[PDB]
Coordinates of C-alpha atoms and ligand atoms in Angstrom, one line a residue:
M23 CA 12.8 -5.5 -27.7
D24 CA 15.0 -2.6 -26.6
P25 CA 14.2 -0.5 -23.6
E26 CA 14.1 2.8 -25.6
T27 CA 11.5 1.2 -28.0
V28 CA 9.5 0.0 -25.0
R29 CA 9.7 3.5 -23.4
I30 CA 8.5 5.2 -26.6
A31 CA 5.7 2.7 -27.4
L32 CA 4.2 3.0 -23.9
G33 CA 4.5 6.8 -23.8
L34 CA 6.9 6.7 -20.7
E35 CA 8.8 9.9 -19.8
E36 CA 12.6 10.1 -20.5
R37 CA 13.3 9.9 -16.7
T38 CA 12.2 6.2 -16.8
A39 CA 15.1 5.3 -19.1
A40 CA 17.4 4.3 -16.2
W41 CA 14.7 2.0 -14.7
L42 CA 14.1 0.4 -18.1
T43 CA 17.8 -0.1 -18.7
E44 CA 18.0 -1.8 -15.3
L45 CA 15.1 -4.0 -16.3
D46 CA 16.7 -4.7 -19.6
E47 CA 19.9 -5.9 -17.8
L48 CA 17.9 -7.9 -15.3
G49 CA 16.0 -9.7 -18.1
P50 CA 13.0 -12.2 -18.0
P51 CA 12.3 -14.3 -14.9
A52 CA 13.4 -17.9 -14.8
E53 CA 9.8 -18.8 -14.1
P54 CA 7.9 -17.5 -17.1
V55 CA 5.2 -14.9 -16.4
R56 CA 1.7 -16.5 -16.5
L57 CA -1.5 -14.5 -16.2
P58 CA -4.6 -16.5 -15.0
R59 CA -7.5 -16.1 -17.5
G60 CA -11.2 -16.6 -17.5
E61 CA -12.8 -18.1 -14.4
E62 CA -9.4 -18.9 -12.9
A63 CA -8.7 -15.1 -13.0
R64 CA -12.2 -14.3 -11.7
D65 CA -11.6 -16.7 -8.8
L66 CA -8.3 -15.2 -7.8
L67 CA -9.6 -11.6 -8.2
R68 CA -12.5 -12.4 -5.9
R69 CA -10.2 -14.0 -3.3
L70 CA -8.2 -10.7 -3.4
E71 CA -11.4 -8.8 -2.8
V72 CA -11.2 -6.8 -6.1
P73 CA -14.7 -5.4 -6.7
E74 CA -16.8 -7.4 -9.4
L75 CA -16.9 -4.4 -11.8
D76 CA -13.1 -4.0 -11.8
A77 CA -12.4 -7.7 -11.9
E78 CA -14.6 -8.2 -15.0
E79 CA -12.7 -5.3 -16.7
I80 CA -9.3 -6.7 -15.6
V81 CA -10.1 -10.1 -17.1
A82 CA -11.5 -8.7 -20.3
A83 CA -8.4 -6.5 -20.9
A84 CA -5.6 -8.9 -20.0
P85 CA -2.7 -8.3 -22.3
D86 CA -1.2 -10.8 -24.8
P87 CA 2.5 -11.3 -25.6
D88 CA 1.9 -10.9 -29.3
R89 CA -0.5 -8.0 -29.5
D90 CA 1.0 -6.2 -26.5
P91 CA 4.8 -6.8 -26.9
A92 CA 6.1 -3.6 -25.2
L93 CA 3.7 -4.0 -22.3
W94 CA 4.5 -7.7 -22.0
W95 CA 8.2 -7.0 -22.0
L96 CA 7.7 -4.7 -19.1
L97 CA 5.3 -7.0 -17.2
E98 CA 7.9 -9.9 -17.2
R99 CA 10.8 -7.7 -16.0
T100 CA 8.7 -5.8 -13.5
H101 CA 7.6 -9.1 -11.9
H102 CA 11.2 -10.1 -12.0
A103 CA 12.4 -6.9 -10.4
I104 CA 10.0 -7.6 -7.5
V105 CA 10.6 -11.3 -6.9
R106 CA 14.4 -10.9 -7.0
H107 CA 13.8 -9.2 -3.6
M108 CA 11.5 -11.7 -2.1
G109 CA 11.8 -11.5 1.7
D110 CA 14.2 -8.6 1.5
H111 CA 13.0 -5.5 3.4
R112 CA 16.3 -3.7 2.9
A113 CA 15.4 -3.3 -0.8
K114 CA 13.7 0.0 -1.8
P115 CA 10.0 -0.5 -2.8
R116 CA 10.4 0.0 -6.6
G117 CA 7.2 -1.2 -8.4
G118 CA 7.9 0.8 -11.6
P119 CA 6.1 3.8 -13.2
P120 CA 2.4 4.1 -13.8
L121 CA 1.6 3.6 -17.6
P122 CA -0.1 6.4 -19.5
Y123 CA -3.8 5.7 -19.8
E124 CA -3.7 6.3 -23.6
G125 CA -2.8 2.6 -23.6
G126 CA -6.3 1.7 -22.4
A127 CA -7.4 -0.8 -19.8
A128 CA -4.2 -3.0 -20.2
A129 CA -2.2 0.1 -19.2
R130 CA -4.6 1.2 -16.4
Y131 CA -4.5 -2.3 -14.9
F132 CA -0.8 -3.0 -15.6
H133 CA 0.2 -3.3 -11.9
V134 CA -2.8 -5.5 -11.2
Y135 CA -1.4 -7.9 -13.9
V136 CA 2.0 -7.5 -12.1
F137 CA 0.3 -8.5 -8.8
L138 CA -1.6 -11.5 -10.3
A139 CA 1.6 -12.8 -12.0
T140 CA 3.4 -12.6 -8.7
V141 CA 0.8 -14.2 -6.4
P142 CA 2.3 -17.8 -7.0
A143 CA 5.8 -16.6 -6.0
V144 CA 4.7 -14.8 -2.8
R145 CA 2.4 -17.7 -1.8
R146 CA 5.4 -20.1 -2.1
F147 CA 7.4 -17.8 0.1
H148 CA 4.4 -17.7 2.6
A149 CA 4.4 -21.6 2.6
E150 CA 8.2 -21.7 3.1
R151 CA 7.9 -19.4 6.1
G152 CA 5.1 -21.4 7.6
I153 CA 2.6 -18.5 7.3
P154 CA -1.0 -19.7 7.7
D155 CA -3.0 -19.5 4.5
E156 CA -5.7 -17.2 6.0
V157 CA -3.0 -14.7 7.0
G158 CA -1.4 -14.9 3.5
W159 CA -4.7 -14.3 1.8
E160 CA -5.9 -11.6 4.2
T161 CA -2.6 -9.7 3.5
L162 CA -3.0 -9.9 -0.3
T163 CA -6.7 -8.6 -0.2
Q164 CA -5.4 -5.0 0.0
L165 CA -5.1 -5.3 -3.8
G166 CA -8.9 -5.1 -3.9
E167 CA -8.9 -2.1 -1.5
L168 CA -6.3 -0.3 -3.7
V169 CA -8.2 -1.0 -6.9
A170 CA -11.4 0.4 -5.3
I171 CA -9.5 3.4 -4.1
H172 CA -8.3 4.2 -7.7
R173 CA -11.8 4.2 -8.9
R174 CA -13.1 6.5 -6.1
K175 CA -10.2 8.8 -6.6
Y176 CA -10.1 9.1 -10.4
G177 CA -13.4 7.7 -11.7
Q178 CA -12.2 4.8 -13.9
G179 CA -10.5 1.4 -13.1
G180 CA -6.8 1.2 -12.2
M181 CA -4.3 0.7 -9.4
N182 CA -1.5 3.2 -9.1
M183 CA -0.1 2.2 -5.6
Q184 CA 2.3 -0.4 -7.0
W185 CA 5.1 1.0 -4.8
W186 CA 3.1 -0.1 -1.8
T187 CA 2.1 -3.5 -3.2
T188 CA 5.9 -4.4 -3.5
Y189 CA 5.7 -4.9 0.3
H190 CA 2.9 -7.5 0.1
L191 CA 4.4 -9.2 -2.9
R192 CA 7.9 -9.6 -1.3
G193 CA 6.4 -11.2 1.8
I194 CA 7.7 -8.5 4.1
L195 CA 4.2 -7.1 5.1
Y196 CA 1.4 -9.1 6.9
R197 CA -2.1 -8.1 7.9
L198 CA -2.7 -9.5 11.3
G199 CA -6.3 -8.4 12.0
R200 CA -7.1 -4.7 11.9
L201 CA -3.4 -3.6 11.5
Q202 CA -0.6 -4.5 9.1
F203 CA 3.1 -5.0 10.2
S204 CA 6.2 -4.9 8.0
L205 CA 9.7 -6.2 8.7
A206 CA 11.7 -3.0 8.9
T207 CA 15.0 -1.6 10.3
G208 CA 16.0 1.8 11.6
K209 CA 18.8 3.9 10.2
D210 CA 21.2 2.2 12.6
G211 CA 19.9 -1.2 11.4
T212 CA 17.9 -2.0 14.6
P213 CA 15.0 -4.3 13.6
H214 CA 11.5 -3.0 14.2
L215 CA 8.0 -3.6 12.8
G216 CA 6.5 -0.9 10.6
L217 CA 2.8 -0.5 11.6
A218 CA 0.2 0.4 9.0
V219 CA -3.6 0.7 8.9
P220 CA -5.4 -0.4 5.8
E221 CA -8.6 1.4 5.0
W222 CA -10.9 -1.6 4.7
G223 CA -12.0 -3.3 7.9
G224 CA -14.1 -0.6 9.7
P225 CA -13.1 1.8 12.5
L226 CA -9.8 1.5 14.3
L227 CA -11.7 0.1 17.4
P228 CA -9.5 -0.2 20.5
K229 CA -10.3 -3.9 21.0
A230 CA -9.3 -4.6 17.4
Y231 CA -6.2 -2.5 17.6
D232 CA -5.1 -4.2 20.8
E233 CA -5.7 -7.6 19.4
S234 CA -3.5 -6.9 16.4
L235 CA -0.7 -5.6 18.6
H236 CA -0.9 -8.8 20.6
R237 CA -0.4 -10.9 17.5
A238 CA 2.8 -9.1 16.2
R239 CA 5.6 -10.5 18.3
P240 CA 4.3 -14.1 18.3
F241 CA 3.8 -14.0 14.5
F242 CA 7.2 -12.5 13.6
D243 CA 9.1 -14.5 16.3
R244 CA 7.6 -17.7 14.9
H245 CA 8.0 -17.1 11.2
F246 CA 10.9 -14.6 11.1
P247 CA 12.8 -15.4 14.2
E248 CA 16.1 -13.8 12.8
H249 CA 14.3 -10.4 12.9
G250 CA 13.7 -9.9 16.7
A251 CA 11.8 -6.6 16.8
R252 CA 10.6 -5.3 20.2
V253 CA 9.0 -2.1 19.0
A254 CA 6.4 -0.9 16.4
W255 CA 7.0 2.4 14.6
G256 CA 4.6 4.5 12.6
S257 CA 4.7 7.8 10.7
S258 CA 1.2 9.1 10.0
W259 CA -1.2 12.0 9.7
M260 CA -3.1 10.4 12.6
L261 CA -0.2 10.9 15.1
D262 CA -0.5 14.7 14.7
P263 CA -1.4 16.1 18.1
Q264 CA -3.2 19.0 16.3
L265 CA -6.2 16.6 15.8
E266 CA -7.0 17.1 19.5
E267 CA -8.2 20.6 18.7
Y268 CA -11.0 19.1 16.6
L269 CA -11.8 15.5 17.4
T270 CA -13.7 14.4 20.5
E271 CA -12.9 11.9 23.3
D272 CA -15.0 9.4 21.5
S273 CA -12.5 9.4 18.5
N274 CA -10.6 6.2 18.2
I275 CA -7.5 8.1 16.9
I276 CA -7.5 10.4 19.9
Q277 CA -7.8 7.5 22.4
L278 CA -5.2 5.3 20.8
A279 CA -2.6 8.0 19.9
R280 CA -2.3 8.5 23.7
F281 CA -0.4 5.3 23.9
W282 CA 2.2 6.4 21.4
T283 CA 5.6 8.1 22.1
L284 CA 6.4 10.7 19.4
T285 CA 10.0 10.9 18.5
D286 CA 10.3 13.6 15.9
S287 CA 10.5 17.3 16.8
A288 CA 7.5 19.5 16.9
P289 CA 7.3 20.5 13.2
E290 CA 7.6 24.1 11.9
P291 CA 4.1 25.7 11.7
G292 CA 4.7 26.8 8.1
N293 CA 5.8 23.4 6.8
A294 CA 3.2 22.2 4.3
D295 CA 4.7 18.8 3.6
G296 CA 2.0 16.9 5.6
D297 CA -1.1 18.4 4.0
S298 CA -1.1 16.1 1.0
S299 CA -1.0 13.0 3.2
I300 CA -4.0 13.9 5.4
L301 CA -5.9 15.0 2.2
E302 CA -5.1 11.6 0.5
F303 CA -6.2 9.5 3.5
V304 CA -9.3 11.5 4.4
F305 CA -10.6 12.5 0.9
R306 CA -8.4 10.7 -1.6
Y307 CA -7.8 14.2 -2.7
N308 CA -7.4 14.9 -6.5
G309 CA -7.0 18.7 -6.6
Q310 CA -10.7 19.6 -6.2
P311 CA -11.7 23.0 -4.6
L312 CA -11.5 22.6 -0.8
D313 CA -15.1 23.6 -0.2
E314 CA -16.3 21.0 -2.7
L315 CA -14.9 18.3 -0.5
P316 CA -17.4 16.5 1.7
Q317 CA -18.0 17.6 5.3
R318 CA -20.1 14.8 6.8
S319 CA -17.7 13.6 9.6
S320 CA -15.9 15.6 12.3
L321 CA -12.6 14.8 10.7
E322 CA -13.6 16.0 7.3
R323 CA -14.7 19.2 8.9
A324 CA -11.4 19.4 10.9
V325 CA -9.1 18.9 8.0
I326 CA -10.7 21.7 6.0
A327 CA -11.2 24.2 8.9
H328 CA -7.5 23.9 9.8
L329 CA -6.4 24.5 6.2
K330 CA -8.9 27.4 5.7
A331 CA -7.4 28.9 8.9
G332 CA -4.0 29.1 7.2
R333 CA -2.6 26.2 9.3
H334 CA -0.9 22.9 8.3
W335 CA -1.1 19.2 9.1
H336 CA 2.0 17.2 9.9
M337 CA 3.0 13.6 9.7
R338 CA 4.4 12.6 13.0
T339 CA 6.5 9.6 13.9
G340 CA 6.3 7.5 17.1
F341 CA 6.6 4.0 18.6
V342 CA 4.8 1.7 20.9
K343 CA 6.5 -1.3 22.6
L344 CA 5.2 -4.7 21.3
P345 CA 3.3 -6.7 24.0
Ligands
MFK401 C1 -3.8 6.2 16.2 C2 -3.0 5.0 16.7 C3 -2.3 4.3 15.5 C4 -1.0 5.1 15.0 C5 -0.5 4.4 13.8 C6 0.4 5.3 13.0 C7 1.0 4.5 11.8 C8 0.0 4.3 10.6 C9 0.8 4.4 9.3 C10 -0.3 4.4 8.2 O1 -0.8 3.4 7.9 S1 -0.7 6.1 7.6 C11 -2.3 5.7 6.8 C12 -3.4 5.3 7.8 N1 -4.5 4.7 7.2 C13 -5.5 5.5 6.7 O2 -5.5 6.7 6.8 C14 -6.6 4.7 5.9 C15 -7.8 5.6 5.6 N2 -8.4 6.0 6.9 C16 -9.3 5.2 7.6 O3 -9.9 4.3 7.1 C17 -9.8 5.7 8.9 O4 -9.3 7.1 9.1 C18 -9.3 4.9 10.1 C19 -9.9 3.5 10.0 C20 -7.8 4.8 10.1 C21 -9.7 5.5 11.5 O5 -11.2 5.6 11.5 P1 -12.0 5.8 12.9 O6 -13.4 6.0 12.5 O7 -11.6 4.7 13.8 O8 -11.3 7.1 13.4 P2 -12.0 8.1 14.6 O9 -12.8 7.3 15.5 O10 -10.8 8.8 15.2 O11 -12.8 9.1 13.7 C22 -13.3 10.3 14.2 C23 -14.4 10.9 13.2 O12 -13.7 11.0 12.0 C24 -14.4 10.1 11.0 N3 -13.3 9.6 10.2 C25 -12.3 8.8 10.6 N4 -11.6 8.5 9.5 C26 -12.1 9.1 8.4 C27 -11.8 9.1 7.1 N5 -10.6 8.5 6.7 N6 -12.5 9.8 6.2 C28 -13.7 10.6 6.6 N7 -14.0 10.5 8.0 C29 -13.2 9.8 8.8 C30 -15.1 9.1 11.8 O13 -16.2 8.6 11.0 C31 -15.6 10.0 13.0 O14 -16.7 10.8 12.5 P3 -17.7 11.5 13.6 O15 -17.0 12.0 14.8 O16 -18.4 12.6 12.7 O17 -18.6 10.3 14.0

């Protein structure tokens, strides 16, 4: 197939042409793409904590190279475009575009098939790096979380956070308890660990947070000794000191943010670039009228009150030294 024919068949916008040309030149992977099917697929989906409803739909809709040639062409090359950067955190996280939902369940779940086809490659990388199986699996379970999030956010099955799953699938991100850590480098090339907080797993309890922080250096120094990070960095809505106006002392965010050293400038009050982040993480916002959003928690109340007041939320950046 030719990349223009693929683009047109799948309903992809003209701006995706450059990506598809790149994928055309890259070509099919040396290891042919294999999707698990039937109970094999159900077993893997369940290991990845994908909800039963979604898993059943994913297995039912799995595409076929003969009936779905354009989608299959893209599946092979998208998988290839990820595994070519296995272990490489310097590569940008390019998972490819979302497919228009006019292509049905195969299109909606496209990046889930990408993830399933890539599990064997990343598990091999985990083994080569000596990563314990339980860490490898715990890391990959965010697929189920992100599937679940799609359904909450939009109302039908899907997974449109494929940019983020490139980290898991390249073996550059690991969940070590409540927190995730990714191999990362600053602009001057200095190694650090990027810290992230997956939604599933309950509140960010101080004891769970501290336990994750204690695991970070031992884990990376054992399996990625060439990296040598001494610091964790984070950029997040939850590092915004404005939260202190609204959250109480019993808030986990308030207690733990006090350990962080913020390194960006106090943002301009009128800068609205951080509103979308907090609305995504608190509400999985999809453009609904602000006063239709729930108001059951202190944070839900805070986000809306602050925005109603004409004020803005800002992503802030900081670090903590690794124990
Ligand atoms: C702060 C130290 C760490 C700094 C790390 C910065 C780098 C992080 C880079 C990233 O990963 S940005 C994305 C971060 N991840 C998310 O936002 C995932 C979705 N969010 C969550 O699941 C929770 O917000 C989280 C587990 C992170 C924290 O929940 P907690 O319950 O521990 O937070 P906290 O104790 O401060 O909550 C105060 C109140 O807000 C409520 N709340 C917290 N998160 C909420 C939420 N996401 N949606 C609705 N309510 C929420 C919480 O229930 C409680 O309600 P009440 O006061 O009414 O009892």
